[PDB]
């Protein structure tokens, strides 16, 4: 079965370097032309890269032309990406892939995401998103957790201790400007029972070793 | 550069339905050009090769056709496994160059969102920054337009959005949305408004509260 597996994949500093690998199993390696693919967050697909079967032949993307570096070593049947001064930009997902005749690639293989930042890890921060005492009951109400300022991701947001897994949406966390991740969980709940139940988001942040119960009691407004 | 536009930039429709996707080429690529399917999360799949050969596993509902600029990309009949984002490749010259993507969605009526607004905490006003949410709840289509006004004034470049993945069970989107601020400028203003455009309303939605009361 033709498979490609990459790894080497990574948090790196700005203006460093990383070295990406994909090995491939199955087909002749040196009997066709590999391509370097990447996918930034919630874009499209761009290509980096193309090398002949031989290695004679290098391709590159004007984007990327000159700063980082496709090679491929036949022998151990692994093609690679040596990546120099890095940008923020270039975090992305990397796909290696086969020309397989006609410009069409087959097969892709999982991807491996980069991400280039200069951030330490940090536990997050959860605070309540709470709605007003002012709710008329019958109505729906809807509370939440801002879980903020933490690298890297994930962190798990579930509510009650898994008791209550109705009308929850877990937003996909958002890159602030410092560098660090926020995201927010929320809940929506008849607006009847504010007063009488609590409602605990639940947040584990293992990276960091960070466990943090967070009730999102109202306020009077 | 060869540009590669993709047109629409999203498709809703029904289990079963007749979806058609065009890639429109700058400059002549005579029959080059690949179609893929990329599922969330997951590497893409070869669908389409040579404009119009179907690879080798890739179910017969799927079609190719078009020459030179202009290409179209046809599902006969929509099954639940093909709702995914679909891309265009040239293959004809360097630089290799895709379309913008489009995303297919999954067809249910009209539902306006529920919206909600939520005030930056004590604990946070204690940091120096305040985070004001606005959520939109259970809502399709998902074009919706969301500005924040603070006083009445128009906030710009100060929020970011989040969409969540379509329901399994009522094919709705939620959206959050987070107003960054300082301690300072929220302790200096009074009524923070979020105002909802959508489809399905009929008026804008504001929803607002005042800090001097919370």
């Known amino acids: 079965q033709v498979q490609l597996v990459q790894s080497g994949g990574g948090l790196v500093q700005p203006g460093g370097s990383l070295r990406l690998s994909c090995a491939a199993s199955?087909?002749?390696?040196?009997?066709?032309?590999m391509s370097w693919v990447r996918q930034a967050p919630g874009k499209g697909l761009e290509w980096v890269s193309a090398i002949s079967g031989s290695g004679g032949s290098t391709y590159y993307a004007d984007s990327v032309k000159g700063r980082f570096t496709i090679s491929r070593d036949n022998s151990k049947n692994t093609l690679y990406l040596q990546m120099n001064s890095l940008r923020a930009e270039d975090t992305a997902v990397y796909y290696c892939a086969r020309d397989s005749g006609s410009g069409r690639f087959d097969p892709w293989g999982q991807g491996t995401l980069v991400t280039v930042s200069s951030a330490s890890t940090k536990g997050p921060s959860v605070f309540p998103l709470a709605p007003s005492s002012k709710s008329t009951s019958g109505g729906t109400a809807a509370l939440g957790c801002l879980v903020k300022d933490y690298f890297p991701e994930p962190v798990t947001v579930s509510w009650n201790s898994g008791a209550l897994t109705s009308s929850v949406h877990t937003f996909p966390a958002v890159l602030q400007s410092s560098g660090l991740y926020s995201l927010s969980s929320v809940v929506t709940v008849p607006s009847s029972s504010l007063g009488t139940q609590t409602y605990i988001c639940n947040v584990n942040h293992k990276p960091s070793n960070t466990k943090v119960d967070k009730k999102a009691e109202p306020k009077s407004c | 550069d060869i540009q590669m536009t993709q047109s629409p930039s999203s498709v809703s429709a029904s289990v079963g339905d007749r979806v058609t996707i065009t890639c429109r080429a700058s400059?002549?690529?005579?029959?080059?050009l690949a179609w893929y399917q990329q599922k969330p999360g997951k590497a893409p799949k070869l669908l389409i090769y040579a404009a119009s050969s179907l690879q080798s596993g890739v179910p017969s509902r799927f079609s190719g056709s078009g020459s030179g600029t202009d290409f179209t990309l046809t599902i006969s009949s929509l099954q639940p496994e093909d709702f995914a984002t679909y891309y265009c490749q040239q293959a004809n010259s360097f630089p290799l160059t895709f379309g913008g993507g489009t995303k297919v969605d999954i067809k249910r009526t009209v539902a306006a969102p529920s919206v909600f607004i939520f005030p930056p905490s004590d604990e946070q006003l204690k940091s120096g920054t305040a985070s004001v949410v606005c959520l939109l709840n259970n809502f399709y289509p998902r074009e919706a337009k969301v500005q924040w006004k603070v006083d009445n004034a128009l906030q710009s470049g100060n929020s970011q959005e989040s969409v969540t993945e379509q329901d399994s069970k009522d094919s709705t989107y939620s959206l959050s949305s987070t107003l960054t601020l300082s301690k300072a400028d929220y302790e200096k203003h009074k009524v923070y408004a979020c105002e909802v455009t959508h489809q399905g309303l009929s008026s804008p939605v504001t929803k607002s509260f005042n800090r001097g009361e919370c």
């Open positions: 199955g087909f002749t390696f040196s009997s066709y032309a």
């Open positions: 400059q002549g690529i005579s029959s080059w």
